[PDB]
Symmetry: D2
Subunit: 249 residues, 4 copies
Amino acid sequence: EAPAAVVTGAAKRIGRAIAVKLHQTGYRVVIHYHNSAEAAVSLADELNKERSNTAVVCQADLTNSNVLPASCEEIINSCFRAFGRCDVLVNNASAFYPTPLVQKTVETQVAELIGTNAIAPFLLTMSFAQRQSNLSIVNLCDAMVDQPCMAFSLYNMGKHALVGLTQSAALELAPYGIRVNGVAPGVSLLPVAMGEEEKDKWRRKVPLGRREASAEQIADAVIFLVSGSAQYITGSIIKVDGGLSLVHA
Amino acid sequence: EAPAAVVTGAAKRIGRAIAVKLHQTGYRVVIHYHNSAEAAVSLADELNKERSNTAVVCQADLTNSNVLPASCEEIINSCFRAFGRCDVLVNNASAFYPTPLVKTVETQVAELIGTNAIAPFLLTMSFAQRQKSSNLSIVNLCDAMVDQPCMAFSLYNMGKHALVGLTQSAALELAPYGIRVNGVAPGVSLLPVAMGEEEKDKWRRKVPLGRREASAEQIADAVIFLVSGSAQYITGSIIKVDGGLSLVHA
Amino acid sequence: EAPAAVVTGAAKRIGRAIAVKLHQTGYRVVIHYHNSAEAAVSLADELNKERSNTAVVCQADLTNSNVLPASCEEIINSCFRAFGRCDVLVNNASAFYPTPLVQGKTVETQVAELIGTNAIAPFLLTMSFAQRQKGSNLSIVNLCDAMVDQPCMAFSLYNMGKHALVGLTQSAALELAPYGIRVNGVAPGVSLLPVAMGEEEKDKWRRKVPLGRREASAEQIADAVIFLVSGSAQYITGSIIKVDGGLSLVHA
Amino acid sequence: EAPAAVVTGAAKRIGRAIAVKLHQTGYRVVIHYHNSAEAAVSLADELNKERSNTAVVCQADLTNSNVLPASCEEIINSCFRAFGRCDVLVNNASAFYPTPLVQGKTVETQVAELIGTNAIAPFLLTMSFAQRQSSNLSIVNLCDAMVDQPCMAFSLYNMGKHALVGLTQSAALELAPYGIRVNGVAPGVSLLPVAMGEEEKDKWRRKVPLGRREASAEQIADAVIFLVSGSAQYITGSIIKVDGGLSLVHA
Ligand SMILES: NC(=O)C1=CN([C@@H]2O[C@H](COP(=O)(O)OP(=O)(O)OC[C@H]3O[C@@H](n4cnc5c(N)ncnc54)[C@H](OP(=O)(O)O)[C@@H]3O)[C@@H](O)[C@H]2O)C=CC1
Ligand SMILES: NC(=O)C1=CN([C@@H]2O[C@H](COP(=O)(O)OP(=O)(O)OC[C@H]3O[C@@H](n4cnc5c(N)ncnc54)[C@H](OP(=O)(O)O)[C@@H]3O)[C@@H](O)[C@H]2O)C=CC1
Ligand SMILES: NC(=O)C1=CN([C@@H]2O[C@H](COP(=O)(O)OP(=O)(O)OC[C@H]3O[C@@H](n4cnc5c(N)ncnc54)[C@H](OP(=O)(O)O)[C@@H]3O)[C@@H](O)[C@H]2O)C=CC1
Ligand SMILES: NC(=O)C1=CN([C@@H]2O[C@H](COP(=O)(O)OP(=O)(O)OC[C@H]3O[C@@H](n4cnc5c(N)ncnc54)[C@H](OP(=O)(O)O)[C@@H]3O)[C@@H](O)[C@H]2O)C=CC1
Ligand SMILES: Nc1nnc(CCC(=O)c2cccs2)s1
Ligand SMILES: Nc1nnc(CCC(=O)c2cccs2)s1
Ligand SMILES: Nc1nnc(CCC(=O)c2cccs2)s1
Ligand SMILES: Nc1nnc(CCC(=O)c2cccs2)s1
């Protein structure tokens, strides 16, 4: 019987490459999504075409709120409903936009940025552990977390909290055989709304190849941390940044 | 004329020693509190006995919610109403209790992330918005043990990591306005009120420097340095005040 | 042809496991040794039995001295002589012992061994490795220490060398990236405990490890090395992977 | 009686600023120097005309060698000879220049100077400081805030400053029981090298978020003075960045 993984924000970009690569490794997958319904459903079809009954979709808003715990419990519950087990959780979903200190309500910006990047991962980790071989969690962190983008306070706080969670849950879940690690991209797939000139400005800064990471290169690191080659690894965060975080201003 | 500071959770313990030390240095002070009204008022009276009209109190719950932004705006406003200015913000208030992975979880999230992280972000926003030979700065009370966390304190540890993030992010963003943003990071200081001496001792014995916890006044000393003219080039720094505790392996 | 790797201190323990696992992945290997000749040759014998002329040995003291540059240039040249290429360098050799601040080697000898092996030799080997490609998956892996910020009592010099090694890892990652040479680290917590250590003291450390109350096997350390040199890590440089079972996360 | 401090590389720039501010705080000072004999004697002269018998100079090469231990032992002995005590050691002296990995002095010499001045000498001075020991004893190591975002082709210099972080933490741990605190001060850009042209100076100035300017030597000395003071009696193994946000700025 094949293991199963939840990947949050799996319909597009990095999360999709992660779900595809896990599926290629033999995992059954829950493709969580928020708005990208048609892409998620299309991805599940593609994966079910390759090996039937190996992929389902699962819709959830991961904004912070009083019902977020129920939503997170449901994501994990859906893996058991589909596959009777849940071996891997990948915390990938993330809101990302500026929140300047000096000038959507601030209430909403806090809920979305802290919710998706930190609180939902925490609640998913809780539900993962409570519902419980080679069990592990991978959190998508940020290699630039100590050299953050200007005016991205709330986002930076979320990713910083995600580091805290990675370490805290590694320590706490170790006695249950659950490993908790992170993969930290620098620049990978650049945001759709970012202009081409700004994209080339970031590309030029990467020491290794003057280019961004492909989604697949990020996924490769995830695959390593969930595999048998990482059985002793927990609380570790692997930068996949082409040296970007090493470059001074 | 005298600068003014806001200290959150200033009724007791570390917050109180910080408020007392800032006042002795010549600052007028907003003593913010949540439940400790009698202690906040007593401190205010003591300080006002030293120099008239130099201390006020301000009550607010710093738990995350829809009203939190308004409460934080109000805390900062109280300093302007009382003193006409606000030169220093000290984010000290903090909830601290275990949240094991395996009182509702949404309230734990609201309390632990609210007090330790979101409230400080909101207060920083409001502090800076109102400033848009002056030495403006913010001190965030962090945790020296943030990368070697207490077992089953994930939410608290997440709040404190977030606070490091804010410290760095706000330092970068507010530097053009000449607002410095720094942190003080205790290891073990004033231990929980009722903790047995045998348990207190277990922690004291781990501290390389003197086998004792930090006094609130020693934590306060580092805050005083960071708000002073001797730290005018220091921003985004987090000073550990831990007697070497974070350096000790398991 | 097959890629070629240099592993320093590869005769025993963690270096042996790294050299073995690299050999099993298809690398030809230079087994460097200082005092462990018998061990290095018997590993080469075992590897060459699997695939003929894929393993050679190379002797050198990695202590800091006026001749260290020459010895490091020769370790790297041994790879080019044997195999015609050098694709991977694993800086594994390490001296490890206490150097108390407050009180039969002299202190200047302790400096030469602890800083030489853990930091200077890695730097010189990195330099020679890079120069011999100055005129396709090139990388260096440095054996670091997960406990570097919570150091063993009275191990100042050792700890200085492992800190220096982090610096080397980052500086060389930055400088060599335009040459397509990646530079990373693997950081064990408690793996194979030293032969010198008493059994009760071994169990003391084993008990502190969150993940399974046991030390890392040498092969688990080697697994992270294999990952870092592989095509699955083509965008990774200046990274240091802890392989410590969560030990570094545990407070006093 | 007045406390006494050793400051390495104290003839000029940041080390001088540190020596001056410790002297203004009431310390007697040992002004260590290597080549800057004239400027060292001149500083000692200025300080002694402020208070008699409160400054001495001490010559020493801090390049790594088999004699370096005796040299460092003698620096410490010189403070006890002049002043009868040694309360503070400041590790300030530092060689700084490129060592490209891919292509002057020999590589042996570069290792000896860059690792010796930045790491080995601080280690041996710490050893001798501790061995020779109301009281407020401490050591301050001049580190680098850009240690994890290093200057291109400065491997050996960066290895040394990294090693200095290791020593700061290792010594803090080991000397705590003796009541000796060990901390660091990490500048980003302070006094730029005299060799650097004004255009490259401004380039570096422009990058600093706080004021678009380098730290003054006095601003560095302030943080040193705090760490040696009674306001820091619980602080050990801490490295204070004095960098105006420089290390926080992405590429
Ligand atoms: N791209 C890069 O260069 C970098 C990425 N990272 C991290 O790696 C991970 C993946 O990156 P990337 O693919 O760019 O991520 P994206 O920014 O593309 O976001 C991925 C998914 O997050 C989901 N999401 C956003 N808001 C919510 C919400 N409120 N509730 C539920 N889901 C939500 C969205 O799903 P939907 O489309 O279904 O609505 C989105 O597709 C993230 O954690 C990111 O922070 C870190 C550094 C750099
Ligand atoms: N003490 C130590 O050893 C350590 C302390 N620290 C940090 O140093 C700082 C001060 O420490 P310490 O004195 O122990 O702090 P305490 O735990 O004593 O808490 C300080 C004050 O926080 C306020 N507070 C708690 N919850 C709320 C809330 N929901 N809304 C508003 N205020 C609230 C309380 O005010 P009220 O009484 O008026 O209700 C409390 O008195 C904290 O940030 C702490 O995390 C870090 C490591 C160790
Ligand atoms: N073992 C563990 O738990 C931990 C290991 N590490 C790092 O992992 C790596 C491997 O660890 P481990 O296998 O225990 O290493 P060892 O301590 O067993 O040393 C490995 C080899 O280093 C070589 N060596 C020692 N001194 C010299 C010298 N002066 N010149 C040349 N070679 C020398 C020796 O070769 P020979 O026998 O041929 O003379 C020795 O066999 C090391 O870098 C270590 O620092 C980090 C943390 C923990
Ligand atoms: N300046 C800056 O922007 C930064 C400085 N720092 C650190 O702060 C500290 C002070 O900086 P700065 O004033 O610029 O230092 P300098 O570069 O001016 O060096 C200070 C002194 O180091 C001494 N020195 C050099 N080589 C030797 C040697 N072989 N033996 C003995 N002494 C030697 C020299 O003494 P003499 O003249 O007597 O021969 C020199 O005057 C240093 O540790 C530096 O690395 C860190 C980051 C940035
Ligand atoms: N959820 C997301 N997090 N980060 C994203 C893109 C990151 C990005 O655009 C840059 C990162 C560093 C310089 S630019 S999407
Ligand atoms: N808000 C608070 N944060 N930390 C507090 C007390 C710290 C404490 O008891 C210990 C911290 C680490 C070992 S014991 S109160
Ligand atoms: N060269 C070596 N480096 N580290 C070695 C053994 C590691 C070891 O015993 C411990 C390291 C940290 C706690 S115990 S050998
Ligand atoms: N001993 C010394 N160390 N650092 C010195 C000057 C540092 C310097 O010029 C810069 C550091 C980072 C950008 S420019 S002298």
